[PDB]
């Protein structure tokens, strides 16, 4: 067996390259720069630097540019998305020098996270046997609102009708979203630290029954929703490591782990860090629809047989991020934000229906579906790069002329928008502008009359209605209640500042309530149980 | 868009590790060790060194062992497969010191190989329109033998009946195998350097019509064989980079490239170098059956829609390598050699039928199928770790009691065996023993009487019948002709030595012919067109 595997490797030694020629930096210096890199740069440039949103920062490129090009670029930034760390005064000349030296070295390697680590992190707090057989409290679970108290690493269940915080549960740091099990009993939350918590809404007092950590960093979680699979499996995508994990939908036991490392859809070259973004459960087949960002692939992971996984890798467009179902729940309208496109994934026929060109940096969230008087059923989205609102036709059967076309546009307060919203019972369309550099715009939301779309929008002074005092008071993500007569908004203020949840009477557009509480720290995402569980948007 | 991707990464800086603490070595020293590493170590330890047959040689482990342990281990080796580079005198004390220092550094990175590189390497020598419409020569193409003249980087087409070299074609270095297109017109060969050459057997004189390089290092190639896909696609697996590529089966144009990097079947942890081994074309579905070694996965890559690839990842056992069809052409009998198992892949129902325990380091090649008088249809394989020959039952329908069981065993001349062989028309069973340390055994093949399996085998002095003179004269891979009355053997002698192809009258077991030629340099693999094309084994 020794002489058999004894012939030379076909790989040419000359072409295998050693890495160096980097400026010398001590342990203290290298760590200070490493800490800055993850607190300030990692989000956009990635953990490895092959590059996300912007150009790669690998040694081959950085050393080519040299110390000074790097110091200067980091110092003033660029008009294409790269913040000015020097001019703004964010970082010192000394620090920027350190970062320029740092990016000239081989990127340090973060740990991997396989089954051993997963199982070690897996915990069953309350076994399925020991869990109640019926609802042991008199809460109106369907109208409950799971609110993320970001910096607190908790979530608060707010009663829809009473406007009170019914329970505060400790979770992973800065939970990114909440999702509901198909049965409507379990609430699944995932922190950016990849920590998932499963919460039983039937317990006397809603409590965590299981937990697990599926990676170092993550964003999405979902539950199986195909007929005959209620609470069967639970999936979660991770940023690092580039992977997603399928787990038991009852105990959260890790079953399968799949690497999303691979070839890009555009250049068809290898990308060592294709982060997993949105994940939505199919209703057409027993599959999960996974978005793989950097490679721009939409994976149809079939869980009919989890031991021998079948995945259909559909090419879309680079930088897939968020998105949601069309009115019929068959077409996944997802946004390839830095490509300025919205990919239409047919979950039934399992193929890319079309690539719709939209405004700069679309950010639909899960989007807004409504029937246009002239264009029929459409799905809409606002943007981060401009104040447009794209309306895309979603009816190939009865409206072929408008299917997959940016049929019309609306104009909002400006760019920096994050979430557009509406409801089957509502006649209004809201658009927030959370990251708009103007304080007044970023603290208010635009509202359109669906019954008269030619009319300009109305501006609701959300943050002002909260009456909180100092702070940026950024408003974010409109969200209806089960009956669709009220729309909730989060007044995302600092951790040491005061925050609130503003409710609006959708019928009159008048302030209805304001939820304040010392525990309501940095409220961001809000997810009404029913509307979330049944994809009502 | 800047403040939105402006929050800190969930990844803890403290856990992202810088790599070093390695012994200082100059550029000349590092390259001398790098050159040795790929000429002598890479085959077993892998390119990135995360371990294959050989153990992990990554810095975390090597530095823990320290300079001394390393020098000593490399010097004397171990009884578990690690050759003794010092004791044998293969490497000097000076070199071993260099290697011990080298493995303590971060492994240098070999280049990737995506579509840009592939297309650049793609060449259409003769367009499909310019190619003949019928066979323009009088050769008996079905009985042609594609022989690999390993060190010459060529292959020789030998006429079966005349025993003469009809044509010598330049190819990639050390072609590993030959495969035939379903039509039986095109001959596909692939070098270990990943260079594939497509050869038209209908041209006045067989000539290359297209070529391409699918990686830095590779071993397998295959053609689509499902009804209605003759010559449609052509796949090829690569060692580095860990990937396989689907190409147009007419012009060899690159269409799809898939990364095999991923999670292992056993530990379910990430493996950065899962090399692709055997690839066999399905007859049950429009799929290719790909073996992924280190992760032990068998991929069913469906090409019905190559733009939206669907892959069924089946778990098997680590270290999948070679294997072949059962008599019926439904079950892929593959060998997970370092696991001492043979995986049975059901190509129809698309599932792992069973994991059969066999001898030490099974190496079937494509195996040998024959009907046992007592046990019914069976598939057999010899080994590299011992002299056994495992007979596994392959008839679940009419012989359930013997299906997937190591029903019986035969004993050969000893270990170091590579290929067992037989034919529907033949009543003999041959096994070679190419890497047996004994010269006499390694230069001869064992033959069994299928009509009397209790009888010991007969030893055929192949190399002696060649009458070549000096040299190790290792005999390798028995191979029948279309009619199944002759069995060919390659007398794999040195490049500066003399080699030959020995033919045997299968009916009498008597020397029939001997093919010698100054051009027949280091003949290894031989592939009869018909028997290869129609998986007759
Ligand atoms: C991939 C992804 C989804 C889709 C999940 C799904 O549907 O399966 C999503 C959804 C969301 C949703 C879902 C809302 C919905 O209605 O579906 C919310 C509330 C939200 C709050 C925020 N997200 Fe989100 N978000 C990211 C990723 C994602 N966010 C980022 O990587 C990014 C750009 C940078 C970061 O630092 O995380 C980012 C910034 C933010 C914020 O700044 C927000 C406002 C506050 C926070 O906690 O960081 N993200
Ligand atoms: C994965 C794989 C296959 C199956 C491909 C398929 O069916 O599509 C195969 C087949 C093969 C076959 C196919 C025979 C058949 O009838 O199917 C032959 C002749 C062959 C000649 C050799 N192989 Fe092979 N071989 C490797 C890999 C493989 N060999 C190695 O990695 C290894 C262990 C080490 C190496 O250096 O490549 C190795 C050593 C050898 C040899 O030493 C041989 C005898 C000479 C050589 O050229 O290197 N291998
Ligand atoms: C997104 C919110 C960013 C953050 C945070 C950081 N960078 Fe960035 N960077 C980003 C983009 C979109 C671009 C492209 C700019 C362009 O117009 O091309 C860049 C580019 C760089 C570069 C230069 C790359 C090159 O041209 O070779 C460097 C050196 C760079 N960015 C460094 C860097 C550092 C050190 C940061 C954190 C302290 C940082 N960037 C944050 C987007 C974003
Ligand atoms: C296969 C034919 C091998 C070749 C060629 C080389 N090595 Fe190897 N190595 C191999 C195996 C199977 C093992 C396991 C041995 C055991 O009994 O555990 C090893 C191990 C080593 C080690 C020790 C690692 C450890 O346990 O800490 C070292 C340092 C090592 N091998 C080095 C090495 C070098 C430098 C080689 C080429 C010059 C080399 N090996 C070739 C198998 C094979
Ligand atoms: O987001």
From Swiss-Prot, chains A, B:
UniProt remark on cofactor binding: Binds 1 heme c group covalently per subunit.
PROSITE patterns found in the cross-reference section: CYTC (PS51007)
Keywords: Electron transport, Heme, Iron, Metal-binding, Oxidoreductase, Periplasm, Signal, Transport
Stretches for region N-terminal tail: 1-23
GO molecular function: electron transfer activity; heme binding; hydroxylamine reductase activity; metal ion binding; nitrite reductase (NO-forming) activity
Residues involved in heme c binding: 41, 44-45, 65, 78, 82
Keyword Heme: yes
Pfam families listed in its UniProt record: Cytochrom_D1, Cytochrome_CBB3
GO cellular component assignments: periplasmic space
Residue segments, region D1-heme domain: 110-537
This enzyme's EC code(s): 1.7.2.1, 1.7.99.1
Binding site for heme d1: 176, 219-220, 239, 366, 477
Protein name, entry field: Nitrite reductase
Organism: Pseudomonas aeruginosa (strain ATCC 15692 / DSM 22644 / CIP 104116 / JCM 14847 / LMG 12228 / 1C / PRS 101 / PAO1)
Source taxonomy: Bacteria, Pseudomonadati, Pseudomonadota, Gammaproteobacteria, Pseudomonadales
